[PDB]
């Protein structure tokens, strides 16, 4: 049997807002260590990897391992019926065609309970090895979102160039071309407004702005985002789910 209780239910809500538009059906791996998801979008261009550690849940319980086939649009609809400060409890039996969700309101005068039908979904998992990246950029998440949506006005693809002094995004289209240059920051007010660069060797790649603009729907999950880059390998856009885990996007480069 599986029962997880999260006081910060808003997290779950946000997680689904970041996934429902990119992947439609996904398999949630439930285990003793927590909740994990790994799915490719329908076009096989990007990979999404969600990790929610069991120690981030207020109460956690998992007898046997589970592979819950979830339609993410339906689960998103159900999570839209929950307040941002609601305590959310997931509960599913060992077989169970359904996943139970419980929304507890702060008041304690309101209690919602929903039951979602599951799918028979193949746990079909990719094998992502842990690596070292030539260039890693830590920057504000809203800034990254603003950059991608702005350059979408200019072209289809963004060229991310990564050097020891900062990161540069470039776009080109029939109306012209543009360059955004973010430099390292010698301290701001707080940490989250800083731009820091960890470089071993310079990198420069090209990515589709459409998928990045899909990725930036995870912005309400973290104030900062990091981009990990290495020659000839996919980009990793990572959003930290504070104290709980992380949401990772992998985007294959262009030609």
């Amino acid at each position: 049997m599986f029962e997880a209780r999260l006081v910060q239910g808003s997290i779950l809500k946000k997680v689904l807002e970041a996934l429902k538009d990119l992947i439609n059906e996904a398999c949630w791996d439930i285990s003793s260590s927590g909740v994990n998801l790994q799915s490719m979008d329908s076009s096989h261009v990007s990979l999404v990897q969600l990790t929610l550690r069991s120690e981030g849940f207020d109460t956690y319980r998992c007898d046997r391992n589970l592979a819950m086939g979830v339609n993410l649009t339906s689960m998103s609809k159900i999570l839209k019926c929950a307040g941002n400060e609601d305590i959310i409890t997931l509960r599913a039996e060992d077989n169970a065609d359904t996943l139970a969700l419980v929304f507890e309101a702060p008041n304690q005068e309101k209690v919602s309970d929903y039951e979602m039908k599951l799918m028979d979904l193949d746990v079909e998992q990719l094998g992502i090895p842990e690596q070292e990246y030539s260039c890693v950029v830590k920057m504000p998440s809203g800034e990254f979102a603003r950059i991608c949506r702005d350059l979408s006005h200019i072209g289809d693809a963004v060229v991310i160039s990564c050097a020891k002094d900062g990161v540069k995004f470039s776009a080109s289209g029939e109306l012209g071309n543009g360059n955004i240059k973010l430099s390292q920051t010698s301290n701001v007010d707080k940490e989250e407004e800083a731009v820091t660069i960890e470089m071993n060797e310079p990198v420069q790649l090209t990515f589709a702005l459409r998928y990045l603009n899909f990725f930036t729907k995870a912005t309400p999950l973290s104030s900062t985002v990091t981009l990990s880059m290495s020659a000839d390998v996919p980009l990793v856009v990572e959003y930290k789910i504070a104290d709980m885990g992380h949401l990772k996007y992998y985007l294959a480069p262009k030609i």
Binding site: M40, V45, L126, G127, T206, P234, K254, I255
Partner: peptide
């Protein structure tokens, strides 16, 4: 510039 898949790297 074409688009490479993810199935070529990670599989």
């Amino acid at each position: 510039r074409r688009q490479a898949s993810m199935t070529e790297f990670y599989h």
